[PDB]
Amino acid sequence: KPINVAIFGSTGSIGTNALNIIRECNKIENVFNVKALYVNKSVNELYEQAREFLPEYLCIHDKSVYEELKELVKNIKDYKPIILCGDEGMKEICSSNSIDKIVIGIDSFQGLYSTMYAIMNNKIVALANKESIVSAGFFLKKLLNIHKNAKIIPVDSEHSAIFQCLDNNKVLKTKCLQDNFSKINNINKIFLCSSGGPFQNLTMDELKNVTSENALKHPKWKMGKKITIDSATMMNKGLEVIETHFLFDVDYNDIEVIVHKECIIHSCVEFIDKSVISQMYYPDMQIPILYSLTWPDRIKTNLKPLDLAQVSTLTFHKPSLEHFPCIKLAYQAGIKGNFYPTVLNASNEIANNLFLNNKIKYFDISSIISQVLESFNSQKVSENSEDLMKQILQIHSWAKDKATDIYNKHN
Amino acid sequence: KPINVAIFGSTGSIGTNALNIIRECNKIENVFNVKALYVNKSVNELYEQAREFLPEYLCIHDKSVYEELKELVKNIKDYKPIILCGDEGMKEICSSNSIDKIVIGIDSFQGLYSTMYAIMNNKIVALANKESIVSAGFFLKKLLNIHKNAKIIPVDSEHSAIFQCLDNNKVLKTKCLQDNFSKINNINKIFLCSSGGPFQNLTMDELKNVTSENALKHPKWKMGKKITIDSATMMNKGLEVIETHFLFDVDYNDIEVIVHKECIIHSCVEFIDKSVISQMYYPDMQIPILYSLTWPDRIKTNLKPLDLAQVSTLTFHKPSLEHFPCIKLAYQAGIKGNFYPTVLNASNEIANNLFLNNKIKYFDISSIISQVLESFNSQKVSENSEDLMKQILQIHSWAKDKATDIYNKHN
Numbered sequence: 041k042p043i044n045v046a047i048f049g050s051t052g053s054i055g056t057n058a059l060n061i062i063r064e065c066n067k068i069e070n071v072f073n074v075k076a077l078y079v080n081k082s083v084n085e086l087y088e089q090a091r092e093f094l095p096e097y098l099c100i101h102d103k104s105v106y107e108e109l110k111e112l113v114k115n116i117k118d119y120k121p122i123i124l125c126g127d128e129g130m131k132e133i134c135s136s137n138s139i140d141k142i143v144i145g146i147d148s149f150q151g152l153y154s155t156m157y158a159i160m161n162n163k164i165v166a167l168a169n170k171e172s173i174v175s176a177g178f179f180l181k182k183l184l185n186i187h188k189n190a191k192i193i194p195v196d197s198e199h200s201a202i203f204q205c206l207d208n209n210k211v212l213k214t215k216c217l218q219d220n221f222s223k224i225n226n227i228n229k230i231f232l233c234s235s236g237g238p239f240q241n242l243t244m245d246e247l248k249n250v251t252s253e254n255a256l257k258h259p260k261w262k263m264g265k266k267i268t269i270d271s272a273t274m275m276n277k278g279l280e281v282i283e284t285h286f287l288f289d290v291d292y293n294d295i296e297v298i299v300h301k302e303c304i305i306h307s308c309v310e311f312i313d314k315s316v317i318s319q320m321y322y323p324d325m326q327i328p329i330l331y332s333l334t335w336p337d338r339i340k341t342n343l344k345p346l347d348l349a350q351v352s353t354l355t356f357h358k359p360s361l362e363h364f365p366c367i368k369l370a371y372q373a374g375i376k377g378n379f380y381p382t383v384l385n386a387s388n389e390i391a392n393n394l395f396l397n398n399k400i401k402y403f404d405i406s407s408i409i410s411q412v413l414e415s416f417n418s419q420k421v422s423e424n425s426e427d428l429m430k431q432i433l434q435i436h437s438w439a440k441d442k443a444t445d446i447y448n449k450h451n
Numbered sequence: 452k453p454i455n456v457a458i459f460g461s462t463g464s465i466g467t468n469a470l471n472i473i474r475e476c477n478k479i480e481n482v483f484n485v486k487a488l489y490v491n492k493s494v495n496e497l498y499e500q501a502r503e504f505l506p507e508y509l510c511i512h513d514k515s516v517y518e519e520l521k522e523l524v525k526n527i528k529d530y531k532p533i534i535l536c537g538d539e540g541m542k543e544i545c546s547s548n549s550i551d552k553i554v555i556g557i558d559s560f561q562g563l564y565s566t567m568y569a570i571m572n573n574k575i576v577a578l579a580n581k582e583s584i585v586s587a588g589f590f591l592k593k594l595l596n597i598h599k600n601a602k603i604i605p606v607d608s609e610h611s612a613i614f615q616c617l618d619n620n621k622v623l624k625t626k627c628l629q630d631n632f633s634k635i636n637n638i639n640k641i642f643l644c645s646s647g648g649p650f651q652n653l654t655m656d657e658l659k660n661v662t663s664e665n666a667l668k669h670p671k672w673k674m675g676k677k678i679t680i681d682s683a684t685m686m687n688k689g690l691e692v693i694e695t696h697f698l699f700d701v702d703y704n705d706i707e708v709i710v711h712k713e714c715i716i717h718s719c720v721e722f723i724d725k726s727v728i729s730q731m732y733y734p735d736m737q738i739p740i741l742y743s744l745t746w747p748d749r750i751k752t753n754l755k756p757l758d759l760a761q762v763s764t765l766t767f768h769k770p771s772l773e774h775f776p777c778i779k780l781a782y783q784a785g786i787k788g789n790f791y792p793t794v795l796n797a798s799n800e801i802a803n804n805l806f807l808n809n810k811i812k813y814f815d816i817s818s819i820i821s822q823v824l825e826s827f828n829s830q831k832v833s834e835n836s837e838d839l840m841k842q843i844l845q846i847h848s849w850a851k852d853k854a855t856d857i858y859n860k861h862n
């Protein structure tokens with residue numbers, strides 16, 4: 041019987057990849073009902089999607105375009121959706137008994153907030169937003185212990201890969217973000233594969249002078265600017281190291297970053313017997329998104345089969361921490377624990393955007409982050425969920441301000 | 452609590468690797484009990500193993516070395532094993548209530564009979580003898596349908612790999628050699644990895660000249676002569692294609708042989724969504740053997756962790772069927788069904804031995820096997836288990852004789 045899905049951020053990359061794979065899978069067999077779509081402010085794309093999927097719910101965050109949506113929707117004949125606005129509309133979707141699975145494809149406050157509401161309503165939450173896990177991992181873990189039937193299923197490609205390598209008979213005795221997930225699943229170590237970004241062959245001298253244009257003009261996957269800069273510094277991978285720690289409870293000393301430039305093996309799991317299982321496919325966000333929606337089952341697709349003999353050659357090498365010091369900073373913050381990951385994420389948000397806007401240089405990114413981390417002091421971690429969310433927000437804002445102050449002091 | 456194990460073929464490659472990993476796993480805790488050791492005739496080696504492991508049962512096939520074994524074992528103080536012989540001894544071990552799992556590391560008839568008795572006693576059978584599956588696959592399927600608590604767990608490295616790639620939550624709802632195994636496991640296709648053997652890069656003119664000495668001196672792994680020659684002709688992979696079909700109920704058109712000369716990825720499974728899972732490690736029979744004894748759990752080993760950066764490069768290519776025609780013969784025999792696999796296996800046993808002994812040339816191997824296949828006339832499959840076994844043995848003998856007659860004629 042059907043899989044009832046809501047997509048939060050339906051016009052973004054995750055959202056459209058999700059609708060695409062749902063559409064194709066549904067051509068083969070009708071398994072998916074799209075029950076809700078939520079967008080920030082892209083009222084026109086949202087209308088086109090509603091015309092096609094006819095969800096029970098439409099919600100737009102920006103009440104300024106609220107009226108226009110209602111107007112556009114009247115054209116669709118035989119169609120009376122519940123049309124909502126803002127955070128209240130998001131809460132209403134997450135509390136719907138009609139909805140089983142929620143795809144979070146938005147960033148920032150909206151992304152953490154909608155994750156939280158989806159967890160509080162005991163839903164299966166398909167989560168691509170690695171910054172929410174890195175910054176607010178303690179809050180999510182706490183929430184997932186309150187709301188026992190809620191589950192986060194990883195969509196970030198490497199984390200999906202890890203999850204796909206597992207025996208569901210063991211996964212189902214635990215869940216992601218739980219202490220002891222790795223022990224229950226007999227996980228010893230993770231190989232976290234990376235594209236390596238555009239700068240793997242550059243020298244230190246070259247890196248000293250690279251620009252955001254260099255990072256953006258020739259990326260490894262056509263993506264948003266921020267994640268593109270993170271891929272270039274390998275701070276994306278550093279964030280994904282912490283994401284691996286929180287999702288799977290794997291110790292930092294058991295997470296190894298490996299540069300796999302062909303981007304066919306998506307990541308690998310070493311079990312306690314030293315057997316290694318890996319997941320592989322062409323680079324394509326459809327498989328991670330689909331698995332998040334079908335887990336613990338798989339359904340038929342019409343995706344192109346992997347031609348291993350055509351790919352011919354897979355390569356692996358260790359990243360240089362001297363060339364990609366952001367990786368080292370992520371491990372440092374992770375190992376220190378506490379709210380240092382919150383600080384790392386927030387400070388990187390600022391330093392990333394400074395580099396993007398040509399205000400600092402490549403090695404200034406890691407210098408700023410490093411100086412912010414050094415200025416933080418560990419905080420008593422609140423046992424109360426409300427207080428803990430407030431701590432995370434306060435530390436997040438402090439850390440962004442601190443990064444900005446460090447930039448302005450030097451500049 | 453301990454897992455009680457019998458090893459059939461304790462002094463061969465599988466048996467010694469089995470005892471090696473059991474010994475390491477038993478250092479602190481009693482994880483396994485070695486209850487029984489069986490060999491064909493290596494009484495001196497068996498005695499050394501008995502001294503260490505003190506099994507309840509010893510068994511030798513060759514009755515002519517019984518008195519020798521009895522005299523050796525006298526030297527072991529306060530040890531009173533049950534010392535058995537031949538097929539009757541195999542039956543008594545397989546029947547013992549004190550034995551849970553049986554490792555079959557012997558070939559030919561002793562391998563088939565021991566497998567059969569293990570199944571008849573509803574044991575877990577860790578099967579490394581692929582020829583039994585190829586020659587007697589439908590008979591084993593029939594037996595497994597009668598003896599509903601017996602399970603075959605694959606130990607052949609590539610088939611262990613396939614098995615490990617599956618999701619045990621689905622595996623537990625079926626069993627190897629059971630109709631519908633691939634449907635239940637959402638299997639679409641198999642990538643069956645091969646070393647390629649010593650002759651993989653030879654031209655056709657060079658290949659015409661190869662000898663058994665060439666195959667034996669530069670092998671891809673240190674192993675028995677028979678399998679080394681099959682690795683060189685890629686008849687080993689052909690046999691493994693049929694093994695794949697029977698174990699996993701995967702159609703022949705969905706099994707793709709891939710030459711992966713690094714021998715790190717052991718095989719891969721494509722599921723119906725087109726996601727591919729693979730299993731990898733250094734070549735080492737310990738992981739396949741251990742997993743067959745621990746499945747569906749895993750236990751800690753002290754094996755060297757895979758260093759993928761050090762490996763650095765993995766390669767994949769299609770084998771040339773003009774150079775390795777034994778592969779094509781195996782697909783043809785398998786697709787024909789009936790007793791064509793029995794005939795394939797039996798004719799190969801002769802042709803391999805002829806080549807080993809310098810009596811025929813490389814392309815004569817596939818020529819003889821092809822001629823025996825063409826000569827065989829399909830037979831109605833006996834419905835009775837005992838009748839079917841008799842039919843198998845008859846056709847096996849016929850095909851060896853026919854192969855010999857063909858060699859004799861063109862000599």
Ligand SMILES: O=C(CC[C@@H](c1ccccc1)P(=O)(O)O)N(O)CCCc1ccccc1
Pocket residue numbers: 196197198233234235236237260261267270271272274276277303306322323324325328
């Ligand atoms: O986090 C990201 C983006 C950055 C990383 C990457 C990985 C593969 C290609 C290019 C870039 P990095 O450079 O940090 O290794 N991703 O998860 C890939 C999304 C696209 C994708 C790739 C493989 C499988 C499915 C989807």
Ligand SMILES: O=C(CC[C@@H](c1ccccc1)P(=O)(O)O)N(O)CCCc1ccccc1
Pocket residue numbers: 607608609644645646647648671672678681682683685687688714717733734735736739
């Ligand atoms: O059937 C065999 C022997 C023959 C094949 C092979 C494969 C890898 C190296 C050498 C030879 P083929 O040449 O037919 O591909 N085997 O299962 C490998 C046993 C050794 C082994 C290898 C990998 C993992 C664990 C154990």
Ligand SMILES: [Ca+2]
Pocket residue numbers: 515516517518519
């Ligand atoms: Ca004697």
Ligand SMILES: [Ca+2]
Pocket residue numbers: 205206207614615616617618619
């Ligand atoms: Ca598995």
Ligand SMILES: [Ca+2]
Pocket residue numbers: 639702705
């Ligand atoms: Ca098919």
Ligand SMILES: [Mn+2]
Pocket residue numbers: 196197198280
């Ligand atoms: Mn990623």
Ligand SMILES: [Mn+2]
Pocket residue numbers: 607608609691
């Ligand atoms: Mn093999």
